Structure formats: C-alpha cells, structure tokens
A and B are shown apart, each in its own frame.
Chain A
Amino acid sequence: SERWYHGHMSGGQAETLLQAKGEPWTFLVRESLSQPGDFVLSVLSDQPKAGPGSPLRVTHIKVMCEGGRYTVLETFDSLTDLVEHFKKTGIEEASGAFVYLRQPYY
C-alpha cells in the first residue's frame, strides 16, 4: 500500500519508467507537480502510442486531496483505499476509455 508510491516524480519520468518495463496496466502513484497536495495515478495502457512496436500510451489521472480525503464522485480515507477500489473495475480516463490497475511498479 506504499511501494507503488514514488513521491516527488514527474509525469515524464513515470512514462519512461512504465514504458521501459512495458507490461500493460502497470501503475504507480506520485505527487502532482502542478498542484501541491494532490497526486497523480500514472498508468501504462495497452494501446501503442503509434504503429506496431511503438511504446504503450501512458495515462495520468488526477487524484485531488482536500480535508484529508482523496477523490478522482466518491472519496477515500487514504490513497490505499482509492487504489484498492479502482483496482476492481478501473478508471474511466476518458469518454468510454478505461485504464486498469493490475501490476504495481515497485
């Protein structure tokens, strides 16, 4: 519940980290460098960025945090309870586009 968290890490470094270890639905949590106090769910999709062989598309999801609650709707006591909940069914990253949390990036 803490080893998928990587703290102060940029979105581009997450992408590099997840694309190299290139298995779909590999995720990690990092704090947002755009909004302090919030966090970002960085997930490696199964969709290639371009043609065959190209790296897989990395998707970032804002997770807002105020009043000690966490939300991406419903809220959660901790980042763990958030990650645990969306691991079941996924996150609708865009209209009809879902990402899934299968493998944590340690």
Chain B
Amino acid sequence: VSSVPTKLEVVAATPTSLLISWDAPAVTVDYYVITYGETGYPGYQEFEVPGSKSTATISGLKPGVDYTITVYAGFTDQYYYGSPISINYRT
C-alpha cells in the first residue's frame, strides 16, 4: 500500500539477540507489528510496539541461524496491517 516502513536494519547483534531499527513511513502510524522466525519455516513470534518507537530488541534466538524479520505498520483505522518490509539476518 506504498506507505510501508522505508528501511530496516540490524543495529547491534549478539549470537542470541538482535536490535532492529526501522524508519517510519510517510503516513502517521499508530503502532508497529514485528514478526520473526526461521527462514523457510511457518512459525513466527509476534509483538507490537507504540507508534512513537522505531527500534525493537529481538531476544532468544539460536546462534548461526537465518531469521526473517518483518515489520508492519498498524493503524486503528484499518482492518488489516500495512504493507511489510522484511530482511533476513543470520545470528
């Protein structure tokens, strides 16, 4: 839907954790939703973050595993979340 978070980086990593930062999209966001899980597998964990926050910490990962980290914009207006931006990082 085009108004999607414009970048998503891993700012600092330990073998079992990541500190991701995204940059807000052009439109006002009420909250962000972030999922993460192993690339290729259907399971993922989920947690929400206030609209004023652009960084989150992901903990409890296994070392040397490719995880897929996805961020969505959340709006109270909308039934569904915004378009996602996602990367892949190896712990």
Contact = CB atoms under 8 A, between A and B. Distances in A.
Contact of B79 (A8, A91, A95, A99): A8
Contacts, number: 54
Contacts of B48: 10, 12
Interface string B1-41: 00000000000000000000000000000000101011001
Contact of A62 (B42, B60, B72): B42
B44 A62 contact: yes
Given A34-B81, A34-B84, A94-B37, A12 B46 contact: yes
What is the size category of the interface that chain B forms with chain A? Answer: 10 to 19
B42 A72 contact: yes
Contact of A33 (B41, B43, B44, B81): B81
A59 B38 CA distance: 12
Determine chain B's interface SS by DSSP, over half rule.
strand
Contacts of B84: 34
Interface string B32-75: 01010110011111111000000000001000010000001000
Interface in A29-69: 33-34, 36, 49, 57-63
Contacts of A12: 46-48
A11 B47 CA distance: 8
B46 A15 contact: yes
B43 A94 contact: yes
Nearest to A32: B80
A58 to B, nearest CB: 8
A20 interface: no
Interface of B: 33, 35, 37-38, 41-48, 60, 65, 72, 79-81, 84
5 contacts: A34-B72, A34-B84, A36-B80, A91-B42, A92-B41
Interface of A: 8, 10-12, 15, 33-34, 36, 49, 57-63, 72, 91-95, 97, 99
